[PDB]
Design a protein around this ligand. Structure first.
Ligand SMILES: CN1C(=O)N(c2cc(Cl)cc(Cl)c2)C(=O)[C@]12CN(Cc1cc(C(=O)O)cs1)C[C@H]2c1ccc(C#N)cc1
Length: 179
């Protein structure tokens, strides 16, 4: 089961330091669970700009989530989600970076709010896309709906809403069962 999975995680100024750390720990939890499988991983932080923290070929070389994320620094700027998702589609899923032609493409987006930019994500639409929206900005059904445009269909499966960043641990507990 070859899966190329990318974490696209929010580094905007609205995240508290401990919240940003909980995202990193969540990504490590998932990668450790899937060590020695046919999964490959890449990770991109987005805020105003988009930084690839590691590509698939970095993961293949190291297979060490702690080492791969050791130097991540919280950008503390905007939340340009449209640009970020397009970036993943065109700049991360590439064979030259270790992506596999035969693999199933998965994108896991983690964010605390609405995009600050605009456009479309059509270039990424064939990727299986989950989005995890966390915190006070997604308490109403109306506010939760703003995330649907980024995720695969139906939203009932592919959009996860969490009350706090502490619930990422609980989400992992549930996800790990699906392995
Ligand atoms: C179920 N599901 C799922 O919840 N998420 C998921 C993972 C993460 Cl980090 C956050 C969120 Cl929020 C959602 C996933 O990535 C999958 C989709 N599937 C790959 C696919 C296979 C096919 C197919 O048609 O064969 C389509 S997509 C593999 C699943 C999976 C991957 C990793 C863990 C763990 N730990 C548990 C399950």
């Amino acid at each position: 089961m070859n899966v190329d999975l990318v974490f696209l995680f929010d580094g905007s100024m609205s995240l508290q330091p401990d919240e940003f750390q909980k995202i990193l720990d969540f990504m490590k939890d998932v990668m450790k669970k899937l060590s020695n499988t046919s999964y490959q991983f890449a990770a991109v932080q987005f805020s105003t700009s988009y930084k690839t923290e590691f590509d698939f070929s970095d993961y293949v070389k190291r297979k060490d989530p702690d080492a791969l994320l050791k130097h991540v620094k919280h950008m503390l700027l905007l939340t340009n989600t449209f640009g970020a998702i397009n970036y993943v589609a065109t700049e991360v899923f590439r064979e030259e970076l270790g992506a596999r032609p035969d693999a199933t493409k998965v994108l896991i987006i983690i964010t605390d709010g609405e995009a600050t930019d605009s456009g479309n994500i059509d270039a990424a639409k064939d990727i299986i896309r989950y989005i995890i929206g966390i915190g006070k900005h997604f308490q109403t059904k109306e506010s939760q709906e703003t995330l649907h445009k980024f995720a695969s269909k139906p939203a009932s499966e592919f959009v996860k809403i969490l009350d706090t960043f502490e619930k990422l641990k609980d989400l992992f507990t549930e996800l790990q069962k699906k392995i």
